[PDB]
Write a protein that binds this ligand. Structure first.
Ligand SMILES: Nc1nc2c(ncn2[C@@H]2O[C@H](COP(=O)(O)OP(=O)(O)O)[C@@H](O)[C@H]2O)c(=O)[nH]1
Ligand SMILES: COc1ccc([C@H]2[C@@H](C)C(=O)N2c2cc(OC)c(OC)c(OC)c2)cc1O
Ligand SMILES: [Ca+2]
Ligand SMILES: [Mg+2]
Lengths: 422, 68
């Protein structure tokens, strides 16, 4: 029954994970009680990808909530859909991780990982056919980043032939907690290159800009940013959650979106960001405008290796293809020619809450290298003076592991550059 | 290989917290030892000087007696 196990870790990871569940629970007609009151069965046909059934026939998210301190999870619990989650599925320590990758990966997080793997095992073992795992986290803190990557390693060890998928929030000076964010992210990306099959790169720089230069929010809160993230995450998982002419699953996705095993970092796109529904031509233009991208790279600086796009709502499948095909055949400079038919299009009838038309885009572009450069430059600006490193050497790390993580990110960048020029 | 690296990092952090504690403990004990020594030697030298002055005051009374 192609079940997915969802894991959310750290402050960011749990905040956006929680919103995610709010949104999709509403789309599937589940209320804060886990009770179904929807009007279709398109809501229920694949409900088991994300939800386990209850004794009274209630639906309970296949979700595991993880943190090294309890604050955020207390908030999640006391939030709107807080009580939907399995309470055994809250796994947390007391001490925190101090925005320190080393504490999440090596010291504090090591002490909690096994209890997390216990809840994971308990959720996997009752899966008819488990697809893989979905992790929500940021890369700039300590828990979601250090402990999140540690977790991905353990899961890969225990389930080496399942798919690992992340939604990974990338740090930016614009919207920043601490200065060590580049260190934590460079260390984390290195893990993600070896141990995931698909990673959605969600850049906080982009979310800030869309919030500021577009949504016209002058002082954008984390709730504002998370609302974009929530919409993107719902769009990006539509084809898994709903029945269509496609059977979408994680493995087929990875096979069709990843031509080289290391280049599996995707730029998501969304449209629109209202009483006038958009027309298919507007969806198409907006989706592919840099301004609707959530990774803060401009797609005209690179080339698309692959693209997956869904349109949500009742519209003209013919007009979609016409428009899709049109934007390709207007912009062939920005798609690779050596991968025939590298743009794929689908349609769902059910739109999301509050829109009668929407469109979501998953792009594997070489322009994502811009993001990794941005991080590399920042990492190097400190590391060349070994600034701030004592926080990590004090947990047992050596400079060597840093130099290697740096190196592997720059190699990743070189790889993206090689294919942008082929 | 990765698990064993994980073990190494955390054992190194323990080892360093320990060597730091140890070093501190020793540094303290050496300084307090050297301190007591020095302080004592200063008092002892003071008392020695005083006691020589006592002895000298005998040789001044014993010597007045030897003019008779
Ligand atoms: N978009 C988004 N980013 C967040 C949120 N919370 C924290 N961040 C970012 O995540 C990074 C800090 O990590 P955080 O999740 O707070 O630390 P953790 O508890 O150790 O995992 C920084 O880059 C913040 O900008 C959130 O709710 N939404
Ligand atoms: C060539 O690129 C493709 C990219 C994606 C797919 C399908 C199939 C692998 C699947 O699953 N895809 C998928 C999944 C999607 O989400 C899971 C999705 O949009 C959300 C989507 O939009 C076209 C396509 C088929 C393709 O031929
Ligand atoms: Ca501890
Ligand atoms: Mg934080």
């Amino acid at each position: 029954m192609r079940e997915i196990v969802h894991i959310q870790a750290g402050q960011c990871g749990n905040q956006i994970g929680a919103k995610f569940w709010e949104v999709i629970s509403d789309e599937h007609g589940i209320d804060p009680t886990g009770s179904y009151h929807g009007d279709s069965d398109l809501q229920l046909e694949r409900i088991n990808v994300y939800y386990n059934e209850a004794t009274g026939n209630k639906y309970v998210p296949r979700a595991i909530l993880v943190d090294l301190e309890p604050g955020t999870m207390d908030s999640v619990r006391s939030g709107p859909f807080g009580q939907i989650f399995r309470p055994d599925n809250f796994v947390f320590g007391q001490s925190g991780a101090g925005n320190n990758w080393a504490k999440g990966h090596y010291t504090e997080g090591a002490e909690l990982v096994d209890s997390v793997l216990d809840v994971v095992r308990k959720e996997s073992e009752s899966c008819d056919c488990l697809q893989g795992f979905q992790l929500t986290h940021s890369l700039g803190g300590g828990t979601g980043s250090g402990m999140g990557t540690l977790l991905i390693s353990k899961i890969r060890e225990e389930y080496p032939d399942r798919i690992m998928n992340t939604f990974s929030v990338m740090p930016s000076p614009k919207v920043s907690d601490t200065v060590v964010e580049p260190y934590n992210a460079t260390l984390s990306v290195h893990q993600l290159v070896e141990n995931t099959d698909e990673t959605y790169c969600i850049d906080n720089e982009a979310l800030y800009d869309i919030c500021f230069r577009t949504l016209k929010l002058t002082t954008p809160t984390y709730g504002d940013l998370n609302h974009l993230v929530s919409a993107t995450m719902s769009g990006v998982t539509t084809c898994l959650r709903f029945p269509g002419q496609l059977n979408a699953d994680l493995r087929k996705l990875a096979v069709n979106m990843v031509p080289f095993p290391r280049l599996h970092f995707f730029m998501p796109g969304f449209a629109p960001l209202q009483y006038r529904a958009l027309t298919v031509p507007e969806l198409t233009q907006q989706m592919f405008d840099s301004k609707n991208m959530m990774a803060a790279c401009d797609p005209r600086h690179g080339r698309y290796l692959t693209v997956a796009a869904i349109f949500r709502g009742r519209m003209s499948m013919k007009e979609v293809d016409e428009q899709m095909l049109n934007v390709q055949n207007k912009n062939s400079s920005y798609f690779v020619e050596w991968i025939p038919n590298n743009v794929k299009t689908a349609v769902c009838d059910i739109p999301p809450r509050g829109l009668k038309m929407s469109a979501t885009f998953i792009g594997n572009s070489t322009a994502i290298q811009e993001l990794f450069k941005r991080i590399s430059e920042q990492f190097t600006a400190m590391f060349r003076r070994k600034a701030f490193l004592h926080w990590y050497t004090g947990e047992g790390m050596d400079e060597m592991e840093f130099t290697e993580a740096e190196s592997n990110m720059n190699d990743l960048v070189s790889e993206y550059q090689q294919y942008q020029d082929a | 290989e990765k698990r064993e690296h994980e073990r190494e990092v955390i054992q190194k952090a323990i080892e360093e917290n320990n060597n730091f504690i140890k070093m501190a403990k020793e540094k303290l004990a050496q300084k307090m030892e050297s301190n007591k020594e020095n302080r004592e030697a200063h008092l002892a030298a003071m008392l020695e000087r005083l006691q020589e002055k006592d002895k000298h005051a005998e040789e001044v009374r014993k010597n007045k007696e030897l003019k008779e």
